[PDB]
Design a protein around this ligand. Structure first.
Ligand code: SAH
Length: 318
């Protein structure tokens, strides 16, 4: 019984997150369909995916839906041909009507809510390290509760939206330098029901959410002072070795910004796509006077990661 529930959770989370088709656990479904002639498992998969309420409100790209339903029909055809009307009617609905419009990826939260993002086809995508950092923030809510959080390179804003909906920060500052990324970020913040600080904030439960432009290369000590962060986080921001120096300079300025009172806690998570990345970043941090420790690997529970590469996260003392 436990295997079936875990399989259903896997299918739900992987379809909602629009993960790659090859990542779906088709072999466990094959075994379960071979052991039972009951199409109710396929029906439960149907209701937890294409007919899931969060999908119904924010559907993914129609291509994804039709490929998924075609492969699910193909897996249904191998076992006893008890025709399930719901699968074919749903595929009819997907195919018969509408256009591609825009895509959506949704991520479920422990509170029963969800984070819905309208990321499109490199900052316009939700990288895995964002999922990793969001999970870590969910399992360590004391770091952010009623705190001021500044994210460097928010991208689509998955991590920040998850933190705003799970850890109750006092204020959250999404920061990026690319204009289209910031536009999609504001659209995603409004899509998830969060009102910006410029707008009149209501009831003080809503965190003061701001989407500020913050280019790492020219960010001044005054501009960074203006934010007054208690925590600074970044995820998958180590794309090129040259940007290491820009990011380290930004952290340097951030510490220097408020010489009076202490420096904020800095957490940098990244996908280890090249060990040279981590080694070079650590050497630069040591040369700049920032101390660093490796945070322990946390069990990956909620979110389905795209590539399952080795994840890492550094706690930096400024
Ligand atoms: N020099 C710079 N200054 C400010 N932001 C930068 C930057 N260089 C890259 N970025 C931003 O950093 C992001 C890295 S992609 C990571 C996005 C997000 N953290 C996620 O994991 O989904 C991009 O969105 C890009 O816009």
């Amino acid at each position: 019984n436990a295997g079936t529930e875990l399989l259903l959770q896997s299918f739900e989370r992987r379809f909602l997150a629009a993960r790659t088709l090859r990542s779906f656990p088709w072999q466990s479904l094959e075994a379960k369909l071979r052991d039972s002639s009951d199409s109710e498992l396929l029906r439960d998969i149907l209701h937890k995916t294409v007919k899931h309420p969060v999908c119904v409100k924010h559907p993914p790209s129609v291509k994804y839906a039709r490929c998924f339903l075609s492969e699910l029909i193909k897996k249904h055809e191998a076992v006893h041909t008890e025709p399930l009307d719901e699968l074919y009617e749903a595929l009819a609905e997907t195919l018969m009507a509408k256009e591609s419009t825009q895509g959506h990826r949704s991520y479920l939260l422990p509170s029963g809510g969800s984070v819905t993002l309208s990321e499109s086809t490199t900052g316009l995508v939700t990288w895995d390290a964002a999922l990793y950092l969001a999970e870590w923030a969910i399992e360590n809510p004391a770091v952010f509760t009623n705190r001021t959080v500044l994210e460097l390179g928010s991208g689509a804003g998955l991590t920040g939206l998850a933190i705003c909906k799970m850890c109750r920060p006092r204020a959250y500052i999404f920061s990026d330098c690319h204009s289209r990324v910031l536009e999609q970020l504001r659209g995603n913040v409004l899509l998830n029901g969060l009102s910006l600080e410029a707008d009149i904030t209501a009831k003080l439960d809503s965190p003061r959410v701001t989407v500020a432009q913050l280019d790492w290369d020219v960010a001044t000590v005054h501009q960074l002072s203006a934010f007054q962060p208690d925590v600074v986080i970044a995820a998958d921001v180590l794309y090129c070795p040259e940007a290491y120096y820009s990011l380290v300079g930004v952290l340097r300025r951030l510490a220097a910004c408020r010489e009076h009172q202490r420096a904020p806690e800095v957490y940098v998570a990244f996908t280890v796509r090249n060990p040279e990345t981590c080694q070079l970043f650590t050497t630069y941090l040591g040369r700049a006077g920032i101390r660093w420790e490796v945070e322990p690997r946390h069990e990956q529970k909620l979110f389905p990661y795209e590539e399952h590469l080795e994840m890492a996260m550094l706690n930096l003392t400024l």
